[PDB]
Amino acid sequence: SGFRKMAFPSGKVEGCMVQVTCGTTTLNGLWLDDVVYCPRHVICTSEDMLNPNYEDLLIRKSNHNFLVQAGNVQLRVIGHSMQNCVLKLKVDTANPKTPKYKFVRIQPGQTFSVLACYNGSPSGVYQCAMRPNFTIKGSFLNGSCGSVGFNIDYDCVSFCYMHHMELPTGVHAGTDLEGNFYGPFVDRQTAQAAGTDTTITVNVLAWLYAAVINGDRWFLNRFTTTLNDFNLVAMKYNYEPLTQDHVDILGPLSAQTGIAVLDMCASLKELLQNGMNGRTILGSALLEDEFTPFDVVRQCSGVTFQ
Amino acid sequence: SGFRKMAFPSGKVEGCMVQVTCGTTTLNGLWLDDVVYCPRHVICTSEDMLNPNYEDLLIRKSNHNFLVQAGNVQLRVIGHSMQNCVLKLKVDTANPKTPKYKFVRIQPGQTFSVLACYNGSPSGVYQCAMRPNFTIKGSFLNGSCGSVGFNIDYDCVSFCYMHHMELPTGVHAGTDLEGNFYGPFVDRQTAQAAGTDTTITVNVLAWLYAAVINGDRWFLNRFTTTLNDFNLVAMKYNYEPLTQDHVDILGPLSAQTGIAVLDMCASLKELLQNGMNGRTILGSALLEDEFTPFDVVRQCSGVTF
Ligand SMILES: *C(=N)[C@@H](CC1=CCC=NC1=O)NC(=O)[C@H](CC1CC1)NC(=O)c1cc2cc(F)cc(F)c2[nH]1
Ligand SMILES: *C(=N)[C@@H](CC1=CCC=NC1=O)NC(=O)[C@H](CC1CC1)NC(=O)c1cc2cc(F)cc(F)c2[nH]1
């Protein structure tokens, strides 16, 4: 019993973190096979960031302008290429720790683990959701760039996020491992606005089910509702609209708990119209939307990874 | 910027998790050098648990009644011993992944990372605090026993907790790596009451400072209080009394933020007397007491390992 924000074990990712230095800049990179992946703005200086011409800036760089360090091992760079906002340094040694991996571009509403790193050294791990507006609410200081987010499925690391920048609101933005940002953001030293955000309605319901699984039930109504009228209540409160595809995903949780998706929606309605009364659900005074249906199940059924 | 519950990187611990099987029971164990550490109740059957005589029960076991597995490697057991509530199986192969490690009994109020494991396979990592009543609020299912909690200093893993049981309230209890429980608990299939809890006042203050570091300041008052009067307000609300040693530990946070410990206590008074008005601090509608002053500094200054 009990229910926590839980990150994946970070071992397989730790063996892939190096420090990349270009000129005065140093940030983190991801060492897979004989390629190191890092944010392209490692080639910019202090001024370049205002509006960099990266193609021009990278043309002025050669292979030996890059120092890649895996602990104390010095990898020689033997080729360099720029894919979208990601720089790829081809090195001479294939990382012996390379796990089975994929590159994956995740959908809004999905979750992943972040291994926050500084100078190529892991500092901590935590779980995040890709918000509907393509930002994340994490913990990154100067030098955290090139820290990566990932999911582990059995034996395979799925990398989905590489950190690039922080916004004025204090949320975070980055790219997939192919270098394309999530959201409308660009890698220049500018103030950029993410969208209005919305609450991930499907995740909020998966967490209410997690709550029921774990003995919390004070919020369960008798009343029921309709997918159409609930969405009228969703939109008034900034929740992404609940689709029938969402009902079917929520299906095994609705099934395990014996509580119809529609019925749960009505309990959610009252919570939204009526607040929480100074009460708590799974130790929070707010509705949590950073657990997917799959995260609830994996945690509530004890999934492990090889 | 930003402030999250952050676990330590779990790599060094992952290479230490094995699965221990005795008879029908299988739980996790911790493999360091030529010794495997696991909860002693792996010796017990379904019925033994009601009130086991562990000495008698282990006397009936021999080395070969233990199957220890590190993935597929079958370690052979060449000696077994019982230290408090912990069973030590001496094996023939020293774990080659053994990191630099210590065994540490943490004080209440301190925090640590938990690598939740099933069948000797890591499943997830999260951060926890040892409550003042010597329980933890975690996520453990059947078979999570022998999962361990730890801190990483730089190179050195400090093991401080091994999981043994869940309580009726849904909180969790266990031992240090020497086998002595935290709290008044015993390893038998009984319903056991943890004490009244209290809120870790020093941690709540450190989190309010973390809030100030990260731009949240709506709770800062001009009013000030005194250590004596604040405690009369802490007690009415079930907050661990604040000592002068606490003020001094909070000292560099109080210093970084230019806000006197005393003044912050006053803002906390009003938060306690007045609620939060439907507002939030670092993304929560509650006062958070599971961050030590050191956790705030580590996170807000980027410490690595
Ligand atoms: C990379 N290490 C990281 C630095 C960072 C600093 C503080 C908090 N969180 C962080 O993640 N990113 C950067 O320094 C980027 C540089 C690359 C173009 C993307 N820049 C920013 O993150 C940045 C710049 C800037 C200007 C501004 F007016 C307002 C901002 F929010 C802002 N953010
Ligand atoms: C070990 N794997 C783990 C089982 C566990 C099950 C469910 C949720 N969390 C868990 O941690 N621990 C146990 O099975 C122990 C056995 C050892 C004596 C300590 N038992 C319990 O945790 C347990 C027994 C029991 C009886 C009761 F009446 C009320 C309880 F809360 C209770 N808990």
Q: Where would I find the H helices in chain B? A: 11-14, 54-59, 201-213, 227-235, 244-249, 251-256, 261-274, 293-301
Structure tokens at B198: 């209290």
Measured in Å, residue A179 CA sits from the centre of ligand 1 at 17
Query: Which are the catalytic amino acids of B?
Result: 41, 145
Q: How far is CA A43 from CA A21, A25, A50, A165, B151, in A?
A: 9, 7, 13, 15, 36
A285: helix, strand or coil:
coil
Which residue's alpha carbon is at the smallest distance from atom 13 of ligand 1?
A: A165
Whether A117 is catalytic: no
Question: 3-state class of A292 per DSSP?
Answer: coil
Q: Which of B44, B166, B186 to probe ligand 2 with, by most ligand atoms within 8 A of CB?
A: B166
Nearest-angstrom CA–CA distance, B272 and A191: 37
Pairing of strands A17-22, A148-153: unpaired
How many A from CA of B265 to the centre of ligand 2?
A: 39
Q: Which of B123, B138, B142 sits opposite A2 (nearest CB)?
A: B138
What does the angle CA B298 – CA B299 – CA B305 come to, to the nearest 5 degrees? 60
Judge whether A44 counts as a catalytic residue.
no
3-state secondary structure A228-247: HHHHHHHHHCCECCCCHHHH
Length of chain B: 305
Q: What are φ and ψ of residue B55, in 5° steps?
A: -55, -55
Segments in A80-195 forming alpha helices (H): none
Resolution expressed in Å: 2.2
CA distance B56 to chain A (A): 31
Q: Do A283 and B215 touch (CB under 8 A)?
A: no
Cα(B168)–Cα(A82) distance, rounded to whole angstroms?
Answer: 57
Ligand 2 centre distance from Cα of residue A297 (Å): 21
Closest alpha carbon within chain A to B299: A139
How many Å separate Cα A78 from the centre of its chain? 31
* Domains of chain A listed by start with CATH number: 1-14+100-197 (2.40.10.10), 15-99 (2.40.10.10), 198-301 (1.10.1840.10)
What is the rounded (10 degree) CA torsion for A29, A291, A187, A55?
60
Smallest CA-to-CA distance from A42 within A144, A151, A181, A176 is with A144
Give dist(CA B14, CA B24) in Å, integer. Answer: 25
Task: Name the structure determination technique.
Answer: X-ray
Residue A160 CB coordination number (10 Å): 25
* Paired strand residues for A75: A68
Distance CA A154, CA A41 (A): 33
- Cα radius of gyration rounded to whole Å, chain A: 22
- Note whether A88 and A103 are within 8 A (CB): no
Dihedral pair phi/psi, residue B252, rounded to 5°: -70, -30
Q: How many CB pairs under 8 A join A and B?
A: 152
For ligand 1, atom 22, which residue shows the shortest CA distance?
A165
